[PDB]
Design a protein around this ligand. Structure first.
Ligand SMILES: [Mg+2]
Length: 85
């Protein structure tokens, strides 16, 4: 049997990226509702890290890349990474 092997995408808190931009990232790249995006945004602000979604490895890599691309082009240092789920 092929067991599941999925990967969670994380964002890390920083003191520079605006809250509104994080909500945007979550809505756009992780299909979060405004409320759910706000929820995750606040969790990351308070606790340092949060889960954006869980995907197959290649899809997780794609989302991490899209977030970093978007963040840097918007002049924000937002860190996005992935880990085995
Ligand atoms: Mg697990």
């Amino acid at each position: 049997t092929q067991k599941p092997s999925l990967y969670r995408v994380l964002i890390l808190n920083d003191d520079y990226t605006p809250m509104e931009f994080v909500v945007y990232v979550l809505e756009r790249f992780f299909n979060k509702s405004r409320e759910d995006a706000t929820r995750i945004m606040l969790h990351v602000h308070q606790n340092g890290v949060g889960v954006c979604g869980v995907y197959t490895y290649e899809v997780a890599e794609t989302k991490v890349a899209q977030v970093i691309d978007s963040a840097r082009r918007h002049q924000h240092p937002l860190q996005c990474t992935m880990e085995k789920d």
